[model samples]
Target: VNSFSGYLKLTDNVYIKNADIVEEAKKVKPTVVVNAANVYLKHGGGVAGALNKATNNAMQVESDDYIATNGPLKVGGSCVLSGHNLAKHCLHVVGPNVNKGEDIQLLKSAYENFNQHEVLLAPLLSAGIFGADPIHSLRVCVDTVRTNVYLAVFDKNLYDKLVSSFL
Candidate 1:
């Protein structure tokens, strides 16, 4: 198992970590792994890409099929896939292309897209390729997802920013 360096409680059940998301997912064995994606559901970059690659493109195929059949999702829309490599479920969420100031609303939209799944593993929305500030994204994630949220800390600098902002 990978040793986690540190963690901070975001809510009664939500926790942010200074560790790799995939490794933490392997360790925590969450019921669902939520992937932040776009309206087109492409898993080519950022957290979505990493998760898709790790799961051997299982999520990509599912997401593509979903989008093709149901049409492109709008920002905050979502789709689900059954148990794959690491998780029992995979949730693909369409987060908005939010900047720093618009991050909170988009993050809430992303969180609200979740269908009350238990034991969710998610990265900070809009913090990566989406261009939102990491700290702001993290705060919005904490405020929105009131369930058991395991926030993956992929970037050291962002983790530090989250620590500084929260502490």
Candidate 2:
């Protein structure tokens, strides 16, 4: 099973906002990273911010790449969440409050698309922390993966089915 969530208890530590992306990505060169889609959670040197910049500055100075919605789970003001134009194939998932299913469906479609690879940068969070449980989001991510893939988080936690030789 592959977890896209950046949270990991590596060496008894839960990797979060504080992480080194460049070093982390370099460590896991070919891994597909996943998370709850929050870009700010990756303020440190990581692929999230780098990719955002690579996507023509899609990520704003103050924006969470995860769920940038205008209203409750609605696409935010002229903001392009994950999978910017640069993404060969990007899947944006969002739903009303407590609507992990909506996002899951989007994921299924993206995965079903033959072009989808096992490795994918994904971010998933518990809406419950925002007042609703997002366990379903995690379930969807774990269940959504068709093949064994690697998800690298800059916070020194690497989530994936493939074992990296770097280790």
Best by lDDT: 1
For model 2, where is the 10-residue window of minimal lDDT? 9-18
Q: Which regions of candidate 1 deviate over 4 angstroms?
A: 1-6, 99-104
Model 1 weakest lDDT span, ten residues long: 1-10
Q: Give one digit per residue, the lDDT tens place, for model 1 in 27-128.
A: 766778788777777889888888878879887888788778898876767777764777778787876676523434656788776538756878877767
C-alpha positional error of residue 112 in candidate 2 after TM-score superposition, expressed in Å: 5.1
Cα-based TM-score, every candidate: 0.85, 0.34
How much lDDT does each candidate structure score? 0.73, 0.35
Give the C-alpha miss distance for residue 69 in model 1, angstroms.
1.1
Cα error, candidate 2, residue 66 (Å): 20
| Clash-forming residue pairs, model 1 | none
lDDT string, candidate 2, 56-142, tens digits: 555443354343443323321122334434333333322222343334344333323212444544433323222233334344435
